[PDB]
Structure formats: structure tokens, C-alpha cells
């Protein structure tokens, strides 16, 4: 009923009993585990939804049953009866964003989850206003490199209409452009947002690191393209503390993770559009963006600059090269002073995170698939630690694209 | 779509559906509510049904399902049951059910090779000298001067009110570990507890970082034996780096053959309660987790110490850097003895052919995604993009508890 839950390296045990508060199903039965899946395959229910959102709050400010409290229920109970749904106050929504970040099962960055700027963008009408706030969004966070947290909230979903959506799926990215003979040129995971910037007019440019323009929608709505003025995207050329060739290689990567894909539900209403932003970890882009083979693919090419033995696997060169690719992007972004945190600190603090939610909530949802690093798992202490998975709310959700 | 779970892999963008789920038979611990997936643990006509159910596959796996042959087995085997309460294999059965509960373990990344394993049968074994002796043979064949081979021996089954036939030992092959006086561990401390259990049947202990554990043996309702294994028959390999030349200084040593000793092999619901099985190393295992497991040998600080690698800050990455080189002399040092070895590149680029064998021969392939993907460099092999269904199947090998 209630989870064991053990750390291998330590020998603690903890028990999870947070896990009782889900009210989704995840996508796992006793017959089959699907836990290394990436995606899963009327008033009344709104009611409640509402009800236990606005308790979970008014509990937080230590206000339960109070006048406060009661009136709140009794707002939301006439507003969904004549409306069918209901308005967040800003201060609920702030609430609500830094629960669902803390939600999210698949961060590891998770201990900042306090540490969160909302910007309340719920009194945007049109796909201009939403690119104004947008920039708003990316000059706040990025700080001159001095990275902080944030989210942009644009006006929920509505029964009669179409969504605000951004259509890309990072504020930031690197354009992908398919080549004659089926090679890509840029980054391979952008081809086909590439393609639909193109066709909505944008003059595409021709190298590796171009950043694409948004696609910005309001309601039923063509979507708009926005240019980003290249003096808000900040980036880090990449090079090496002793590898004198590495800066050669012309890499680079922007300071700014900025999510902009993914629905924000928060007491049953959902914000469809509603980008967050924090700071990297270097395995990110030194392991998965720069050494996947579906990505920009370049540990061979490393790996022959280090005069490696690349014509059999058991000298390591893909591992050797993949260390130093990580420690290219954590020198490059110390010596840019942006931001970043490498895999063993940032699993360190997760670790303190679980923790403190142990004492708090009684547990920590957790995809181990998702916060043990790409590299050198074993040698971080959450490899060792067993985790329970489950879908609380508030919650960041997937969503179809767009078009 | 399909109405069994879609399973991806998204470095390639290919698609299957896994069907073989359908037919297991037993609960893991995951619900809807909860995914449990990392977790390291969990007959009147119940073992008829199980027996039933083996016997089916058995006559599948041979093309004779529905034959005369096929219902006479089966009659066989529920007058047996009928008069008796258990049932007993045939040679044929015993031997295809020992490949199918390795090809149905989903936590192994080398099932490629499942239909090649010798089985050795031992089941009219009736003391721990013969356990012994039977456990010698096995090492001796599947050793083979460096040339490993896998392989299985079973012995007698667990049987109505009569005492288990149970190796003690988690391995067949494990280092002691000494409990030290100042709280540490000098050896392995992953093996305090039979170290300390040898030294209470009698072991006279080394002090030694790499002395080889005697076996304890027991036969059914019997104290367990103490049998120390002739030194001539476990092969080690001293380890040393291809470049760095002060790393043969350290030491360090593994040995040759991983041979599980402790897991409970069930057949059609007959239970072998002492059925040792080995393989070949794949090289992250003894390169990174028995050499760099903090809570194991430990020696990560101690290599970056002789690399002269920036210990006091973990952003220089100086724990990624000693575990490759560790890596890289576990493999060296293996190849130049000549012992079986495959690195976790090799072994993962061989499951995926496996899955994809899977796929057409049984329609999937139950995989534990967070034990097929190495401990190091993870998103560097091709099972890490690779979307898995886990699920028990039977025969399997399970966890059973301590004899102790
Ligand atoms: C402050 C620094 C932060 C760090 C170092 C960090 C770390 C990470 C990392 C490494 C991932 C895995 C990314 C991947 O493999 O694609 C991730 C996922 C995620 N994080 Fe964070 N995070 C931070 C801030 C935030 C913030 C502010 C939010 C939201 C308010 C957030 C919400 C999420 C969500 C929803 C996912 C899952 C994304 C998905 O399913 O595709 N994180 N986090
Ligand atoms: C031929 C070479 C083999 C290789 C390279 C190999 C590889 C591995 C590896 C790397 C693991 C993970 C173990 C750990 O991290 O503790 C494992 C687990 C396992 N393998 Fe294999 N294996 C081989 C042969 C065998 C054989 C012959 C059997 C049985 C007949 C077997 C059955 C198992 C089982 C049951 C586990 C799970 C053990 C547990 O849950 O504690 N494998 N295998
Ligand atoms: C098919 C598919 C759909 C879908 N929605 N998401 C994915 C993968 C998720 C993902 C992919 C990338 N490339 C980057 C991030 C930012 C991760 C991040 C966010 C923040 C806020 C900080 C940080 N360090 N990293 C997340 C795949
Ligand atoms: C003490 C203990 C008890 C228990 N119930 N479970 C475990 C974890 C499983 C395990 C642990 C270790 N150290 C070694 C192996 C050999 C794995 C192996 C086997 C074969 C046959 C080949 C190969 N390459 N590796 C398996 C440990
Ligand atoms: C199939 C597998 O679930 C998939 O490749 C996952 C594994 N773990 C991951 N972990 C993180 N942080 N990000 C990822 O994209 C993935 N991909
Ligand atoms: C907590 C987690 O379940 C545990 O540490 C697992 C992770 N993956 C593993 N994978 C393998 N092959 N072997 C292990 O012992 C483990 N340990
Ligand atoms: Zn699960």
C-alpha cells in the first residue's frame, strides 16, 4: 500500500506515502511495467479539481477553514455552476506553478522549486502581446548569464475555442535544415519546425547554429512568426580548458532551457501555453544535444581530433570523447560566467531535495529513468536510490502539436 | 491501433507492439497509480495449472503441441501430481526450461547468447561433497583455460516437507570482506556478512583485499559444509592500464567467471532452490560498479589521486575520467590474459539484434530499462533510446530469501 522505498549506497529506508494523494493513472498495470515509456499511448469533475487546488492553497498560507478559505469554495462553486469553469487569483496561479514544477517527476533541478518567477500573462489577446511577454520572459531569465527561474502564463483553455500555443517546443533552438542527399545540417530534432518556420516565411539562414524565429498563436488563429533580436539569445562558444583544437570545431550553446511546449494544470483549468525556463545541466548539451547519434552526432569527429582508436569499441573513444565534450560546455559556460550545473552536484542536491520532501509531504515523485544523468549513472548517488513514480497536481502535462 | 503496449525507440523512430505480454502469468509490483519499475525486490492445482502451462511450451518449442505425445504428458504429469503432490521433469524439459528462464530474464543485457548454455544435470546429487564436486565440474568446464562458456548446473528440486539443497554463498566466486577494527572494511564489503558466517563454519580468514571465499554448502536438513575451492580453478586476472603505467602498482584483480549461486530457478512450478548459473563479464560491471561503488572497493578518489586529477570540485569531472580508465584496464587486462570480456558498447549493440530476434520469434522481449543500461555512458549505447515492457515470465529465476 505503502511503498519501501530503499537507498542502496546507504542502506536507509524510507516509506512513501505522498504516492496516496494521485488521483491519475499513470501508465503501468501489475501484468507490465511501462515506466520507460517518454509518452503515455462535466462540472462536477471540475468541481472538485477546484476544490481540492484551493484547498491545497489555503492550506499552504496556513489559512485553512478560515473566512478567506470558505469564501474562495464559495466563489469557484457559483463561478463553475453558471459558467462551467472558473478564474485563478495571481496569487493561486503563483502557488500553482511552483507545485507543478515541484511536481514534475522527470527534474532533477527540482530543490530550487521556491525559487520560481511567475509572470502573469493572462491578459494576452493576440500573438504580438504574447511575443512582447515573451522577450519579457527570456531578458528576465537570462540576467546576463546570471540564469533564474521563470514562467510565463498565458490565458487558459476555453470550452468555445481554440488555444494560445506556442508552436515550438523550446523558446530557443538551432534550425535543422534537410539537405539534398538526406543529411541534415543544424540540429536533426528541428527539421520539421524548421520546415513549418520556412513556410510561414521565414528566410532561413544555412549554418549549424541558427536560432529559429516563434511561431506564436492566439485563438483559431494562423500562427505568426517572431524574429528574437539576436541581442536577447545569449550563447556560449564553446572550447576546451587544455584542448587547444576543441574552440575549432566552431560548437556552441545557448545559456536559456526554455520549455514551451507543455500544458500547465493547475485546480482542473489548463494553460496550454505557459513557457518555463530554469538553467542547464552540462550533460544536456555536452552528452545528449551535442553526442547523440540522432542529434548533432560529434563524438566521432572529437574523438579522431583526440587521436583515438575509433575502429573498435572496447578502447573506450566514445567514452573518452563524451567526458571531454562535458567539460568543454562546463569550462566554456564558468569562462562565459552563465549559469550552469554538472551532473554530480545537481544529483547531490536532489538528494537533499528528496529529503526535505521526505519531512514535508511525506514522499517525492520521481522517474529514476529520467534523473539518473546520460553519463555515469553509477558513479551519482540518485543511481542508487529507488523511486516511486506518480502523477500529483499541479502538473506539467504533454499536449498534441499544434498543427 | 494495437491493443498491447507501443514501444519506441527514438534514436531510430521505429515502432513494435509488444504482444508476448499477454502471456505472463504473475503481478509485478507496479499499479496505475504508482510505478515501481526501480525497485531492486519485490500448491493443490496451482502447480497443476503451472505444470500444465510449462508442458504446453515445452510441446511448442518442439512443434508437437496438440499431438499425442503432447496429451500424454500431460496426463502424465496430473497422475504424478494426483499421487504424489510434485511432479519430475524429463532430461529435454529440464533443458529447454533452464534457456527459457534465462531468455526471460529481464534484467540481463546478454541474452543473445540464451539458446547456447550448457546444462549440466545434477539432480540426483544427495550430499555437499557431491554438490562440491558437481560445482568443480562447472567451473572447470565453464571457465575453459579463459575461453568461457556459459552454463547451468541444477540440483534436486525443493520437495514436500524434506530440507533444501542451498548454496549460501551469493556467488560462487566472491572476495571477503573483514570488518576492520576502526569501522572500515578491508576486501569487499559487499560480503561482510558470508565472510563472517565462513569464520563461524570454521574458515580460517586471510586479511587481504582479493582472498576467494570458501563455498557453504548445504544439503537437505543439514548444517552447511565448508569446502574451500582448489586455488588451480579460479582463474583472476591481475589488472593493469594499456598507457598508464603505474596503475599494474595498485594491485587490483578480478576474477573470471560471474556465477550466480542464490536464485531460485522455477520450471513449471517446480522449484530449484540451488541452481548456479555463469556466464562472461560484461566489463562496466567489475570496472565500474565492484571497483567504483562507493559502497563497494571504492577506488575512484585513489585512481584520480594517480591521474592528478582536481579532487576537490566536481565540476573538473574527475569521477568520469578515473571510471574510464578503470573501464578501459578492466578490458585491456582481460583481453591480454585472453579471458572472455565484452565492453558495454559491444554488449548493448548485441541486445538490440536480440530485441529485434524477440520481436519476430515471441513478439517482444521483457527488458528491465534500468538494468540493461549500463552504468556508465548510458545514452552512448543504443539501449538507452530504446522504449521497453517489463513483465514477468515463466520459467524465470527468482530472488528467494537467505538460507540463514
Ligand atoms: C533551475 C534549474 C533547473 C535544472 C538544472 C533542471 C533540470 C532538469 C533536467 C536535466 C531535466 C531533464 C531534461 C531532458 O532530459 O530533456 C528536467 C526536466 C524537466 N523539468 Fe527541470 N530543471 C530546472 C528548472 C526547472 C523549472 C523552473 C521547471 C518548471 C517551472 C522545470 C520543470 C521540468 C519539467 C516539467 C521537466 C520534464 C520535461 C519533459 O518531460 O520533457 N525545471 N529538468
Ligand atoms: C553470456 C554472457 C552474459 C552476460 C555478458 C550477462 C550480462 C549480465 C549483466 C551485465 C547483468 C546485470 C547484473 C548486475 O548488474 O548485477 C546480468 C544479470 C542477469 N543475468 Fe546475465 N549475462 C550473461 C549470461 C547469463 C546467463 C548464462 C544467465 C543464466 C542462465 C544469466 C542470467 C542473468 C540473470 C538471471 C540476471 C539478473 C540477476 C539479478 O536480478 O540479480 N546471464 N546479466
Ligand atoms: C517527443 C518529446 C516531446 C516533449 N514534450 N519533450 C521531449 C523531451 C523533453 C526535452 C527535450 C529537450 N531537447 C530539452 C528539454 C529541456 C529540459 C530542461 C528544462 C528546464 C526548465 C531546465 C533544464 N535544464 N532542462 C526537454 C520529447
Ligand atoms: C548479493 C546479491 C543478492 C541478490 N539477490 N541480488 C544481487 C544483485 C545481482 C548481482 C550482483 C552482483 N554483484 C553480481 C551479479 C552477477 C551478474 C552476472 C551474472 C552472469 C551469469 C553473468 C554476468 N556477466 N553477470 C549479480 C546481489
Ligand atoms: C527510452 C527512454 O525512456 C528515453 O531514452 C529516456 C531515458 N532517460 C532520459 N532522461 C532524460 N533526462 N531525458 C531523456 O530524454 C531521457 N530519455
Ligand atoms: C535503485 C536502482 O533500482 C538500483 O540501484 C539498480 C539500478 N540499475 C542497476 N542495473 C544493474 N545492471 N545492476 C544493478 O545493480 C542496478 N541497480
Ligand atoms: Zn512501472
Given at each position: 500500500?505503502?511503498?519501501?522505498?530503499?537507498?542502496?549506497?546507504?542502506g536507509?529506508?524510507?516509506?512513501?506515502?505522498?504516492?496516496?494523494?494521485?488521483?491519475?493513472?499513470?501508465?503501468?498495470?501489475?501484468?507490465?511495467?511501462?515506466?520507460?515509456?517518454?509518452?503515455?499511448?462535466?462540472?462536477?469533475?471540475?468541481?472538485?479539481?477546484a476544490?481540492?487546488?484551493?484547498?491545497?492553497?489555503?492550506?499552504?498560507?496556513?489559512?485553512?477553514?478560515?473566512?478567506?478559505?470558505?469564501?474562495?469554495?464559495?466563489?469557484?462553486?457559483?463561478?463553475?455552476?453558471?459558467?462551467?469553469?472558473?478564474?485563478?487569483?495571481?496569487?493561486?496561479?503563483?502557488?500553482?506553478?511552483?507545485?507543478?514544477?515541484?511536481?514534475?517527476?522527470?527534474?532533477?533541478?527540482?530543490?530550487?522549486?521556491?525559487?520560481?518567477?511567475?509572470?502573469?500573462?493572462?491578459?494576452?489577446?493576440?500573438?504580438?502581446?504574447?511575443?512582447?511577454?515573451?522577450?519579457?520572459?527570456?531578458?528576465?531569465?537570462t540576467?546576463?548569464?546570471?540564469?533564474?527561474?521563470?514562467?510565463?502564463?498565458?490565458?487558459?483553455?476555453?470550452?468555445?475555442?481554440?488555444?494560445?500555443?506556442?508552436?515550438?517546443?523550446?523558446?530557443?533552438?538551432?534550425?535543422?535544415?534537410?539537405?539534398?542527399?538526406?543529411?541534415?545540417?543544424?540540429?536533426?530534432?528541428?527539421?520539421?519546425?524548421?520546415?513549418?518556420?520556412?513556410?510561414?516565411?521565414?528566410?532561413?539562414?544555412?549554418?549549424?547554429?541558427?536560432?529559429?524565429?516563434?511561431?506564436?498563436?492566439?485563438?483559431?488563429?494562423?500562427?505568426?512568426?517572431?524574429?528574437?533580436?539576436?541581442?536577447?539569445?545569449?550563447?556560449?562558444?564553446?572550447?576546451?580548458?587544455?584542448?587547444?583544437?576543441?574552440?575549432?570545431?566552431?560548437?556552441?550553446?545557448?545559456?536559456?532551457?526554455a520549455?514551451?511546449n507543455?500544458?500547465?494544470?493547475?485546480?482542473?483549468?489548463?494553460?496550454?501555453?505557459?513557457?518555463?525556463?530554469?538553467?542547464?545541466?552540462?550533460?544536456?548539451?555536452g552528452?545528449?544535444?551535442?553526442?547523440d547519434?540522432?542529434?548533432?552526432?560529434?563524438?566521432?569527429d572529437?574523438?579522431?581530433?583526440?587521436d583515438?582508436d575509433?575502429?573498435?569499441?572496447s578502447?573506450?573513444?566514445?567514452?573518452?570523447?563524451?567526458?571531454?565534450?562535458?567539460?568543454?560546455?562546463?569550462?566554456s559556460?564558468?569562462?562565459?560566467?552563465?549559469?550552469?550545473?554538472?551532473?554530480?552536484?545537481?544529483?547531490?542536491?536532489?538528494?537533499?531535495?528528496?529529503?526535505?520532501?521526505?519531512?514535508?509531504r511525506?514522499?517525492?515523485?520521481?522517474?529514476?529513468?529520467?534523473?539518473?544523468?546520460?553519463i555515469?549513472?553509477?558513479?551519482?548517488?540518485?543511481?542508487?536510490?529507488?523511486?516511486?513514480?506518480?502523477?500529483?497536481?499541479?502538473?506539467?502535462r504533454?499536449?498534441?502539436?499544434?498543427?
Amino acid at each position: 500500500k505503502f511503498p519501501r522505498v530503499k537507498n542502496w549506497e546507504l542502506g536507509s529506508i524510507t516509506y512513501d506515502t505522498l504516492c496516496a494523494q494521485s488521483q491519475q493513472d499513470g501508465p503501468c498495470t501489475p501484468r507490465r511495467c511501462l515506466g520507460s515509456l517518454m509518452l503515455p499511448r462535466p462540472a462536477e469533475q471540475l468541481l472538485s479539481q477546484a476544490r481540492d487546488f484551493i484547498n491545497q492553497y489555503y492550506s499552504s498560507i496556513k489559512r485553512s477553514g478560515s473566512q478567506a478559505h470558505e469564501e474562495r469554495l464559495q466563489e469557484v462553486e457559483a463561478e463553475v455552476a453558471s459558467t462551467g469553469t472558473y478564474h485563478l487569483r495571481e496569487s493561486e496561479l503563483v502557488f500553482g506553478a511552483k507545485q507543478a514544477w515541484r511536481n514534475a517527476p522527470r527534474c532533477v533541478g527540482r530543490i530550487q522549486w521556491g525559487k520560481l518567477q511567475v509572470f502573469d500573462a493572462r491578459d494576452c489577446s493576440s500573438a504580438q502581446e504574447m511575443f512582447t511577454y515573451i522577450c519579457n520572459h527570456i531578458k528576465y531569465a537570462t540576467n546576463r548569464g546570471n540564469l533564474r527561474s521563470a514562467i510565463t502564463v498565458f490565458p487558459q483553455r476555453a470550452p468555445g475555442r481554440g488555444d494560445f500555443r506556442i508552436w515550438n517546443s523550446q523558446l530557443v533552438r538551432y534550425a535543422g535544415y534537410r539537405q539534398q542527399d538526406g543529411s541534415v545540417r543544424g540540429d536533426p530534432a528541428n527539421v520539421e519546425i524548421t520546415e513549418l518556420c520556412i513556410q510561414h516565411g521565414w528566410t532561413p539562414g544555412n549554418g549549424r547554429f541558427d536560432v529559429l524565429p516563434l511561431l506564436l498563436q492566439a485563438p483559431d488563429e494562423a500562427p505568426e512568426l517572431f524574429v528574437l533580436p539576436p541581442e536577447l539569445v545569449l550563447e556560449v562558444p564553446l572550447e576546451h580548458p587544455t584542448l587547444e583544437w576543441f574552440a575549432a570545431l566552431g560548437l556552441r550553446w545557448y545559456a536559456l532551457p526554455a520549455v514551451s511546449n507543455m500544458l500547465l494544470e493547475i485546480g482542473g483549468l489548463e494553460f496550454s501555453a505557459a513557457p518555463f525556463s530554469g538553467w542547464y545541466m552540462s550533460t544536456e548539451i555536452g552528452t545528449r544535444d551535442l553526442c547523440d547519434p540522432h542529434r548533432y552526432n560529434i563524438l566521432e569527429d572529437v574523438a579522431v581530433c583526440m587521436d583515438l582508436d575509433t575502429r573498435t569499441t572496447s578502447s573506450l573513444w566514445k567514452d573518452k570523447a563524451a567526458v571531454e565534450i562535458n567539460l568543454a560546455v562546463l569550462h566554456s559556460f564558468q569562462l562565459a560566467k552563465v549559469t550552469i550545473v554538472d551532473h554530480h552536484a545537481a544529483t547531490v542536491s536532489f538528494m537533499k531535495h528528496l529529503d526535505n520532501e521526505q519531512k514535508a509531504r511525506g514522499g517525492c515523485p520521481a522517474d529514476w529513468a529520467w534523473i539518473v544523468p546520460p553519463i555515469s549513472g553509477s558513479l551519482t548517488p540518485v543511481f542508487h536510490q529507488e523511486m516511486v513514480n506518480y502523477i500529483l497536481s499541479p502538473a506539467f502535462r504533454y499536449q498534441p502539436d499544434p498543427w
